[PDB]
């Protein structure tokens, strides 16, 4: 489990968090507050995600429709070389 | 054949943090083993047979992938063009879902004064086509203002089978008024919290 | 900055099977919304506005990875060289494990005749060092043959901290015999099913 | 999700089941009966694609570590359920 911090070059995960307020999505997305956009970059074999975590969202599909969904492999928790 | 059998062997050993397969010894008596794992609830054994792991984490993952395929839809009623009628525009997400597991209509029955008299009223839901079929017939409690759930899984199923996504519901409750009760079919201000809604839960 | 914000935007939309972000409209009243999700147990609401998803599948995955960190170890007693003593050789797997969550010693008290008299007996467990410290002092039911659990989490914790992997336990029960009861310390024929054992559950 | 069946060249999973009895491991492995050795082989067009497992399932084992030690463990990413290109 490697964590990219600036100048490292090996296959690790970057970690930038996105809040739906700054995006203009906090009106149709009821919950959660934000998405953990963690991605894998670097050079090895392909630097693929190795540990994935499902995520549940609560959102407006329409003016009168609420959706509760559970997405698999939504959040990349840990990656390394393949 | 052998190169692969040895390949998965080493893989299993790496996952267990073992450099090597355990050396052959004489194990504890089987009766001793089975009895211990039973009492600790780590493993099940039945009818003089093999052992199955209780609290299998693989059975948990097999469950998490099930609810990943099951989606919940909350469809709020829109005011119909007719008396005592609700319009439901089910989200287009309902097209991706084939099998209805559960479908409920939620109505709020408002009762200002708590009656000890006339506790029972009959509420009927009518789906309108072209003709009205009985969605649900339910005798409910008229003691106090409370919610009431109407099972309509079969109807919503049949509706999705026919490729339709719209439901028009007429509601009937003759005994409601004399009980001092009224079903909320609209968002009265300060009563908008009781706006009726359809719940749909479907998979695949 | 923007090219990346748009990257996750498209990503989220592909997971939801949406070609596009929903068009802006007028949503249902919040009181209507919050009340519905509360009753369906799909969401929790905190006063002043905050919304948390009830039955978050992310919490389940966070739970599944937790029990992936935790291992259970069942260590069977080996017969000691002294009277009424058990020897425990904890698996080397216990070295990988640093924090003890739970540790239990299991003893079977055999009571051939069900007595209404002399119901209470005091059983003591002594860890032997160099000196004997009290593992557990428990008053138990002597009505009928049954298992009895002794909590020793703190001691097993202390033991693993000291880098040790061995436990020698002396067992004392003076009132046992006059109760017509006896603790099984060695697995007799057909009584091997009652062989005593230590349970260790630790993580990280 | 692609399934390798004999003649095929795209990135899919081949699956053969291994029973610990046929291997000589059914004495120290109490449970389960066998391991699902599913692995990903195949070819993805070329920033390269490695044909990596995409859906993984944890698995719990019950086994003898010693003559008097029983282990109940839960391993992550033990079974490869589905793969695709990366």
Residue numbers in the entry:
A (entry chain D): 311 to 354, 389 to 426
B (entry chain A), C (entry chain C): 51 to 180, 202 to 258, 283 to 299
D (entry chain B): 311 to 356, 387 to 426
Please quote the paper that reports this structure.
As we had engineered an HRV 3C protease cleavage site into our protein, we could mimic the furin processing of pro-activin A in vitro. SEC-MALS analysis shows that after the cleavage the pro- and mature domains remain associated with each other, eluting at the same volume as the uncleaved protein and showing dimeric molecular weight of 88.3 kDa. In contrast to the uncleaved precursor, the cleaved pro-activin A complex is highly active in the cell-based luciferase assay with a half-maximal response concentration (EC50) of 29±3 pM (all the EC50 and IC50 values and their s.d. values are determined from three replicates). The complex-derived mature activin A conducts signalling marginally better than the pro-mature complex, with an EC50 value of 20±2 pM, which is in excellent agreement with the activity of our control activin A (EC50=21±2 pM). These data confirm that the refolded and proteolytically cleaved pro-activin A is correctly folded, homogenous and fully biologically active and that the pro-domain has only a marginal effect on the bioactivity. The structure of the cleaved pro-activin A complex was determined at 2.85 Å by molecular replacement using the precursor structure as our starting model. The linker between the pro- and mature domains, with the protease cleavage site, is visible neither in the precursor nor in the pro-mature complex. The palm α-helix of the mature domain appears to be disordered in both pro-domain structures, lacking interpretable electron density. With low nanomolar affinity, and considering the EC50 of 20–30 pM, it is likely that the pro-activin A complex has mostly dissociated at the concentrations required for full bioactivity. The response curves of FST-288 binding to the mature activin A and cleaved pro-activin A complex reached the equilibrium very quickly at 25 nM analyte concentration, resulting in very similar Kd values of 209.0±0.6 and 258.6±1.2 pM, respectively.
